[PDB]
Each structure stands twice: as C-alpha cells, then as structure tokens.
Amino acid sequence: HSKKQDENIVVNKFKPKEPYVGRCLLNTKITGDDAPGETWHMVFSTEGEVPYREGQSIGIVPDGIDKNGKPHKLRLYSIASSAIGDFGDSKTVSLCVKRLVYTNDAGEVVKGVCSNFLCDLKPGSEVKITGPVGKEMLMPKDPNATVIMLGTGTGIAPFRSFLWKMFFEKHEDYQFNGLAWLFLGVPTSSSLLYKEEFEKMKEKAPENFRLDFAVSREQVNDKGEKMYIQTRMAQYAEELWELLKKDNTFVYMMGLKGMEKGIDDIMVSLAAKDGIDWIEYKRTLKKAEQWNVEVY
Ligand SMILES: Cc1cc2nc3c(=O)[nH]c(=O)nc-3n(C[C@H](O)[C@H](O)[C@H](O)COP(=O)(O)OP(=O)(O)OC[C@H]3O[C@@H](n4cnc5c(N)ncnc54)[C@H](O)[C@@H]3O)c2cc1C
Numbered sequence: 001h002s003k004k005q006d007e008n009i010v011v012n013k014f015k016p017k018e019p020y021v022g023r024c025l026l027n028t029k030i031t032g033d034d035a036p037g038e039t040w041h042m043v044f045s046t047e048g049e050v051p052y053r054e055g056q057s058i059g060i061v062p063d064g065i066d067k068n069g070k071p072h073k074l075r076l077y078s079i080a081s082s083a084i085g086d087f088g089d090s091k092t093v094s095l096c097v098k099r100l101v102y103t104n105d106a107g108e109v110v111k112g113v114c115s116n117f118l119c120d121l122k123p124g125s126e127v128k129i130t131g132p133v134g135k136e137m138l139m140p141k142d143p144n145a146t147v148i149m150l151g152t153g154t155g156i157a158p159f160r161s162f163l164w165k166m167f168f169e170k171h172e173d174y175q176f177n178g179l180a181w182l183f184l185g186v187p188t189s190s191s192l193l194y195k196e197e198f199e200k201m202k203e204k205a206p207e208n209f210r211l212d213f214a215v216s217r218e219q220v221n222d223k224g225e226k227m228y229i230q231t232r233m234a235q236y237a238e239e240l241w242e243l244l245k246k247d248n249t250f251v252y253m254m255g256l257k258g259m260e261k262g263i264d265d266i267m268v269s270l271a272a273k274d275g276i277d278w279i280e281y282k283r284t285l286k287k288a289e290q291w292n293v294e295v296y
Contacts, residue, residue: 003250003289004138010051011132016074019061019128022046024121025092032190037101039154039193040119043086043094044127050093053083054161055137055252058093059130062117074130075114078137078157078254082164093129096157096193137252137294139165145178146249148240150263152185152229155255155295156193162252167201167209176208178248185214185229185259212236230262241270244285251285253293260295 014020022044030041050058059074066072081094099119100112121127137158140147149159159182166176186192192213202211212232219227233240243249253260264278271278285291
C-alpha cells in the first residue's frame with residue numbers, strides 16, 4: 001500500500017560484476033561556454049533491456065584501471081529521460097552529467113573519473129550500465145497530486161524524467177491534473193538546464209505547471225540578497241506552507257549536498273509563524289512519503 005508508482009518495480013536487474021553493455025548514441029554539452037563547470041546530456045541504447053521508471057538511477061562502471069590494478073566501482077546517476085525515453089521507443093536511457101573538476105589542497109587540478117569518462121564518450125562507444133536502483137524518488141500514484149520539485153544543478157534530472165511523462169507524453173492510465181511546481185537553482189544563466197523544454201511545458205499546460213528559476217549570480221530579491229533556490233521559494237512561502245498542510249502534496253529534493261541546508265533555514269521561519277517546529281514536522285512528512293530528499 002505505497003503512495004508512489006511502484007507496481008511491478010524493477011530493481012537491480014543488472015549487477016556491477018556483470019553489467020548491461022549499451023552504446024552511446026548522442027552526447028552533447030548543454031551549458032554555455034562561460035558557465036562555472038560544463039554539463040553534458042547523453043543518450044545510451046538499452047534495446048529495452050533496462051526497464052526503469054521515472055525517478056530511478058542507473059550505475060556506470062567507467063573504463064579503466066584504478067591506482068591499484070582492479071576495475072573501478074560504479075557511480076550512480078539519476079535518469080534524465082522518462083520511462084519511454086527521449087526517442088519514445090523505450091530503447092534508450094539518458095543522463096545529465098556534470099564534469100567534475102576541482103583543484104585539491106596541494107595545488108593539483110583533479111578530474112573526477114566517472115563523470116569525465118561519460119563526458120568524453122563518443123557516439124558508438126560502449127558503456128557498462130547497472131541498475132536500475134532506487135525506490136524513494138518515484139512519482140506519486142495520484143494523477144491529481146501536487147508535486148513540488150526542488151532542484152539544484154544536475155539534480156534537475158529526475159524532474160525532467162518526471163515532467164516528460166506528465167506533459168510531453170500520452171498514457172492511457174496517467175493523465176496529470178494536479179499542480180506541478182519546479183524550482184531550479186543554478187549559478188549562471190549559462191548553467192540553466194533544459195530551460196527550453198520546461199518553457200514549452202509551461203505554455204502547453206499553464207494550469208498544471210509552474211516554473212521558477214533561481215540564478216544566484218544574476219538575480220536578487222527585495223532585500224538585495226542573492227537568489228538561491230530557498231530565496232526564490234521564500235517569495236511563495238505562505239503558499240508553499242499552505243500546500244504542505246494538504247495531505248496530497250509531495251515534495252522532491254535532488255541535487256548537490258549543500259542545498260538542503262538553506263531550504264531548512266527558511267522552512268523554520270515559515271513553520272514558526274504557525275507555531276509548529278519544522279525540524280520535527282518534517283519527520284511526519286517523511287513517514288507519510290511527502291518530504292522526499294536525495295542529495296549527493
Ligand atoms: C543517487 C545519486 C544520484 C546522482 N545523480 C547524478 C547526476 O544526475 N548527475 C551527476 O553529474 N552526478 C550525479 N551523482 C553524483 C555522481 O556520483 C558523481 O558524478 C560522481 O561521484 C563523480 O565522481 P567521479 O567518478 O567523476 O569522480 P571521483 O573519482 O569519484 O571523485 C570523487 C571524490 O573526490 C572528492 N571530491 C568531490 N568533490 C570535491 C571537491 N569539490 N573538492 C575536492 N575534492 C572533492 C570526494 O572525496 C569524492 O569522493 C549522483 C549520485 C547519487 C548517489
């Protein structure tokens with residue numbers, strides 16, 4: 001008796017020791033040439049073998065030998081494409097991959113293994129695919145639900161997956177009639193992911209979809225404070241808190257680790273004005289499958 005779409009769920013069909021070998025079809029940088037770090041959108045072939053659904057992850061074993069001599073362990077990535085995929089043929093999986101580059105304490109420029117592998121993939125090359133993994137971030141069964149989605153960076157990926165099923169696809173058993181509300185936080189305009197796709201959705205279903213961005217380096221609120229995802233949210237505080245009281249409202253959070261801090265801070269103020277301690281109210285939201293977080 002789960003409140004999420006988990007009928008016939010598949011988990012761990014393919015194992016890291018023996019993964020499904022797909023091929024790269026397309027691989028495209030989807031950030032501007034000026035953004036802080038490039039993100040690539042990529043489409044793999046699965047010939048229908050990898051039966052996922054909105055909100056799951058595939059794992060990726062990257063080609064190569066570690067500093068010791070034995071194969072790399074997998075890195076999980078959220079599925080950017082919806083169940084039926086970007087081609088609608090149900091034979092593809094897509095990823096949204098931030099290329100990881102930082103400079104370490106010692107002055108060296110260090111490239112993350114699995115993300116740089118994916119971002120250097122050419123169409124034709126083989127990719128080792130494991131999974132699908134995850135049961136937390138599945139859509140609500142309820143088609144008249146409210147589905148507030150908070151996301152930073154590559155954390156937009158499951159939400160693209162979500163929304164494609166809702167607004168870009170016809171299904172004889174799922175017709176979304178609730179409210180879908182995306183909040184996407186990024187540094188620059190050039191860091192904006194799938195903007196066009198989301199814009200298109202907003203105009204196709206203006207009743208059911210609401211879309212707010214948060215560009216910290218270019219945007220500012222009344223108090224001149226930088227526009228983080230919680231800063232944007234703060235503008236619709238009284239309203240989001242009102243939806244949360246409703247027992248058919250599902251919140252999803254996905255993106256970099258740091259993002260969960262700011263949102264909580266604002267929820268404290270919001271909850272305090274009602275006379276309710278947030279940090280504890282969230283625990284009832286968790287139990288009820290309504291506050292769903294997953295950060296990395
Ligand atoms: C459920 C889930 C979903 C995910 N979805 C996505 C996704 O959709 N898109 C995406 O791009 N990633 C996603 N990730 C994160 C993904 O695991 C990373 O891309 C991956 O860890 C990158 O590792 P790498 O192999 O590129 O680098 P690695 O070789 O794994 O290097 C990582 C190590 O470097 C260190 N490190 C990390 N950051 C820094 C830093 N800034 N400065 C110094 N040291 C650092 C840490 O010790 C870390 O363990 C997801 C992770 C999880 C758990």
